[PDB]
Amino acid sequence: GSLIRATNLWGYTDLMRELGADPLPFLRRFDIPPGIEHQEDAFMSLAGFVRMLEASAAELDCPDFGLRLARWQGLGILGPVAVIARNAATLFGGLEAIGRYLYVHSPALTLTVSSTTARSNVRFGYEVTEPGIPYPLQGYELSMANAARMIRLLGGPQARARVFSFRHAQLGTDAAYREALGCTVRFGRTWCGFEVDHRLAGRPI
């Protein structure tokens, strides 16, 4: 089964404590080594991680778990791939380098970067593909809240996607999504990801 960089666990302990829950029984349940959160260059089971996020959200009645966990994460969780991104010439180049090398973060993640004459914007379509996992709802929300953070780091602090899209229906509150994502958020759609207009995409880092 695919691994994912254990930086994607950053904040797990802190958030679980914030919610009054003990993180250790969850980590043991999903076969995530305790302490791996703070072990640089370590990697964890993607399947165990996505299931743990679901379990945390369900059992603590925290529908915005993944959105909230992003506050401890952002671009730095990409480790070597962040170094590459920050070195690009423009926001488009930084995001497209993340896409090219996202397998280094996890082989189960695919980013498709597309622009067409027929539609506005550059689209960043995102997929988690791993044999046998439940649909990773909390994982997708964590991924998009992280992406909004990456856009602000690479694009400057007023930078925003034009839209975020999810495959699932809205779970958390309107306020939760607006605070994490900002822009227009579309739910229940055929694709997951975000779009950036060409003005922003062309902005130098």
> For binding to ligand YPQ (CB under 6 A), which residues are involved?
4, 8, 50, 78, 95, 98, 105, 109, 111, 124, 126, 128, 136, 139, 142-143, 146-147, 150
Taking the C-alpha atoms of residue 127 and residue 188, their distance in angstroms, rounded to an integer, is 15
The pair of three-digit structure tokens given for residue 96, joined into one six-digit string: 């497209």
What's the closest the beta carbon of residue 35 comes to ligand YPQ, in angstroms? 19
CB 182 within 8 A of CB 148: yes
What's the closest the beta carbon of residue 183 comes to ligand YPQ, in angstroms? 14
Q: Which phi and psi angles does 3 have, rounded to 5°?
A: -100, 160
CB closer to ligand YPQ, 20 vs 115: 115
Q: CB pairs under 8 A, 24+ apart, for 15-21?
A: 15/65, 15/68, 15/69, 15/72, 16/56, 19/60, 19/62, 21/56, 21/59, 21/60
What's the closest the beta carbon of residue 189 comes to ligand YPQ, in angstroms? 17
Q: Report the candidate in 147, 5, 18 with the shortest Cα–Cα distance to residue 70.
A: 147
CB closer to ligand YPQ, 2 vs 170: 2
Taking the C-alpha atoms of residue 116 and residue 63, their distance in angstroms, rounded to an integer, is 35
CB closer to ligand YPQ, 119 vs 122: 122
CB closer to ligand YPQ, 106 vs 173: 106
What's the closest the beta carbon of residue 168 comes to ligand YPQ, in angstroms? 13
Taking the C-alpha atoms of residue 13 and residue 39, their distance in angstroms, rounded to an integer, is 14
What's the closest the beta carbon of residue 45 comes to ligand YPQ, in angstroms? 11
Q: Residue with the closest Cβ to ligand YPQ?
A: 139
CB closer to ligand YPQ, 60 vs 105: 105
CB closer to ligand YPQ, 60 vs 152: 152
What's the closest the beta carbon of residue 49 comes to ligand YPQ, in angstroms? 6
Cα angle at 68 between 63 and 69, to 5 degrees? 115
